[PDB]
Design an enzyme around this catalytic site. Structure first.
Site, PDB file in Angstrom:
ATOM      1  N   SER A 153       0.840  -1.190   0.000  1.00 45.27           N
ATOM      2  CA  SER A 153       0.000   0.000   0.000  1.00 45.27           C
ATOM      3  C   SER A 153       0.878   1.244   0.000  1.00 45.27           C
ATOM      4  CB  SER A 153      -0.915   0.005   1.243  1.00 45.27           C
ATOM      5  OG  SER A 153      -1.511   1.271   1.422  1.00 45.27           O
TER       6      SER A 153
ATOM      7  N   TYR B 283      -1.019  -0.185  10.331  1.00 44.07           N
ATOM      8  CA  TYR B 283      -1.159  -0.708   8.980  1.00 44.07           C
ATOM      9  C   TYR B 283      -0.021  -0.219   8.085  1.00 44.07           C
ATOM     10  CZ  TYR B 283      -3.413  -1.388   4.377  1.00 44.07           C
ATOM     11  OH  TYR B 283      -3.735  -1.762   3.084  1.00 44.07           O
TER      12      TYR B 283
END
Lengths: 237, 249
Positions: free
Chosen positions: A144, A158
């Site tokens: 990501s 995350y």
């Protein structure tokens, strides 16, 4: 005549589902690994079959080593081979500042995003490697842009998980290059599912299909000299 | 009578010990957190105290939330303030390829290298933040060049752990900049004190020393100097940045 076999973790929706459908459209036999959403995974399997393809849906928590062993054993039994792993299974929890992230949340986020990707890469290496009687293949990790931007005020946990994935991508690529395995990653940004778009130069969220197309390219023979590399799918973010 | 207070995790040897000693020499009160090597941590505390310094040694496992909360409670009662956190506690397991890394190893490596740094950073934010009655301060994470190079054929799990630290450095820097807290990292390469020889592997050790432009391993003192600089007022416009201490690797 023989289809290559692709395993997609977290395949029931989103990027995973789009990757499964695109892979089947391009000729792969597809293994749809899911955790909870059996209904959505089974419907995707039925769809791929109706269109003349081969698909296997397997429930497994990739955070659990025994579940991963059984997932890959199920592929061994159904197809006797593996060619591509897409480490797509991910977990995102509520928006939070780091001072409110507790140990239980860190365990959950790293277990699914990071440990799961390691354990599946491990079982893929044991099958793809020419040193274990395989014919080579590729692994594509779904990272990501959070790994680079840090997800401040949202989910630094995350972001850190995806920084771990990027480092694993680089290290594993170097480690298994000589046994016929390429390892690469995609870094999606905001995937469309006013303040947030303004931080995207292209002015919109991306689609799951756009991410899928990058994953499939990196798994394809077109990328035969790319390993350890990243395709950002982020609209310039 | 009111020294700035620095918590160093994993402080009993190596980079952590060198950082605690240098910080104390420069006037910090130091909290020496350690896991199990009590004799080494106590010898360090005594050395600092003999020179007129202030040192608190605390056994606590930073992977364990209850231990972390007790560790910072002990700082609260002894000093009543915190100024700098050095997230040094790290963990390396045996050389391995990824195909032989199992979940138990991954759990241990991420618990000490990653979860511990998060949990200590969280307790540090609670005390340093101007939103919670602090005056700001610094966090320095001790990462590794492994985050960039990947540690192939050695420990990709460790490299991944340190890539997680790098991303946390960036994200936390951006998150708490407005609360008076700078967050930076050092990336050591090969450091002499930190090679744990297992016996019978001179070839492996020599390979590990290979291809360093400066032609030698680094010292723990070299790493400590970079940590202290980032924690110092000289670095007042640097947050979310990295000093590589790797001899060009």
């Amino acid at each position: 005549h023989m289809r290559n076999v692709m395993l997609i973790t977290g395949a029931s929706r989103g990027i995973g589902a789009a990757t499964a459908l695109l892979a089947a459209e391009r000729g792969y036999a597809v293994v749809l690994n899911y955790l909870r959403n059996r209904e959505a995974a089974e419907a995707l399997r039925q769809r791929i079959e109706r269109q003349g393809g081969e698909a296997l849906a397997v429930a497994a928590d990739v955070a659990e080593e025994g579940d991963v062993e059984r997932l890959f054993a199920s592929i061994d039994e159904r197809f006797g081979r593996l060619d591509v792993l897409v480490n797509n299974a991910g977990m995102l929890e509520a928006q939070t500042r780091l001072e409110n992230i507790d140990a239980a949340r860190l365990h959950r986020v790293f277990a699914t995003n990071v440990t799961g990707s390691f354990l599946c890469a491990r079982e893929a290496v044991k099958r793809l490697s020419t040193r274990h009687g395989g014919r080579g293949g590729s692994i594509v990790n779904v990272s990501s842009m959070a790994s680079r931007l840090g997800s401040p005020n949202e989910y630094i946990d995350y972001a850190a998980a995806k920084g771990a994935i990027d480092s694993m991508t680089i290290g594993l690529a170097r480690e298994v290059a000589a046994e016929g395995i390429r390892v690469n990653a995609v870094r999606p940004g905001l995937i469309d599912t006013e303040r947030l778009k303004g931080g995207i130069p292209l002015g919109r969220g991306g689609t799951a299909e756009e991410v899928a197309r990058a994953i499939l390219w990196l798994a394809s023979d077109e990328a035969s000299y790319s390993t350890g590399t990243f395709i950002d799918v982020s609209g310039g973010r």
